[PDB]
Amino acid sequence: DEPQSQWDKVKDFANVYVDAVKDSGRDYVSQFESSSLGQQLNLNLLENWDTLGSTVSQLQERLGPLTRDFWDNLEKETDWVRQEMNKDLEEVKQKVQPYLDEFQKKWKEDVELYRQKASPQGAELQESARQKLQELQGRLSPVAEEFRDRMRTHVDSLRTQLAPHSEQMRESLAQRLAELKSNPTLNEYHSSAKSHLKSLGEKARPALEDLRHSLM
């Protein structure tokens, strides 16, 4: 029992780590979801050119486990980061009272949920499901274009979104425990959903500030 202004501080980082993990999910789902629909979509542009028929030569066959992959994948992550968004908010403020390890604890949780989204089993699933060939051409037909372009763009964008989110996650969570442990300062603002990414970069580790500016 020691009321003062700790509930406000804890509530800060609470949404911080959530803003990142949540931002990575929306971008992670866009790529994956774009791969499946983009596979049959691209192939169609090729056939429609003249053939005008389309089929399930692979675009559909792959689209099956594709959408289903990211589905259950993000389904857990998103559902977690979300439910934890508000939960952790009142959980961290209620844990600080009794003096718990919500700080080091959240680190084990956040990293857990990230290990999933960050590690899309679907990426290696489809990749290994075929194997016997790398990023290149070997089908002769014009279909290799959409396929190859999709194979590369798939893992490409996937790592493109996780690339930054990965470095930021290491910085946020890092300074996080340091903020509650060191206790540098405390702010009072019921941040709902307005420039949450901007305000974060301004008070985040020396690396996100670069993106905060270059991002209307």
Swiss-Prot record:
Which terms in the Gene Ontology molecular function aspect does this entry carry?
amyloid-beta binding; apolipoprotein A-I receptor binding; chemorepellent activity; cholesterol binding; cholesterol transfer activity; enzyme binding; heat shock protein binding; high-density lipoprotein particle binding
User: What's a single GO BP term from this record?
Assistant: negative regulation of heterotypic cell-cell adhesion
Q: Which residues carry this modification: Methionine sulfoxide?
A: M85, M169, M216
Q: Which domain of life is it from?
A: Eukaryota
- UniProt sequence repeat ranges: 43-64, 65-86, 87-97, 98-119, 120-141, 142-163, 164-183, 184-205, 206-216
**UniProt PTM:** Glycosylated. Palmitoylated.
Question: Can you supply one Gene Ontology CC term for this chain's record?
Answer: spherical high-density lipoprotein particle
The question of whether tRNA-binding is a record keyword is answered with no
Which residue ranges are recorded for the region named 10 X approximate tandem repeats? 43-216
**Record keywords, A-Z:** Cholesterol metabolism, Glycoprotein, HDL, Lipid metabolism, Lipid transport, Lipoprotein, Oxidation, Palmitate, Phosphoprotein, Repeat, Secreted, Signal, Steroid metabolism, Sterol metabolism, Transport
The cellular location(s) given in this protein's UniProt record come to: Secreted
Q: In which tissues is it expressed?
A: Major protein of plasma HDL, also found in chylomicrons.
Record bears the keyword ATP-binding: no
Subunit structure and binding partners: Homodimer. Interacts with APOA1BP and CLU. Component of a sperm activating protein complex (SPAP), consisting of APOA1, an immunoglobulin heavy chain, an immunoglobulin light chain and albumin. Interacts with NDRG1. Interacts with SCGB3A2. Interacts with NAXE and YJEFN3.
So what does this one do?
Answer: Participates in the reverse transport of cholesterol from tissues to the liver for excretion by promoting cholesterol efflux from tissues and by acting as a cofactor for the lecithin cholesterol acyltransferase (LCAT). As part of the SPAP complex, activates spermatozoa motility.
The entry assigns this protein to a family as follows:
Belongs to the apolipoprotein A1/A4/E family.
**Protein name listed in UniProt:** Apolipoprotein A-I
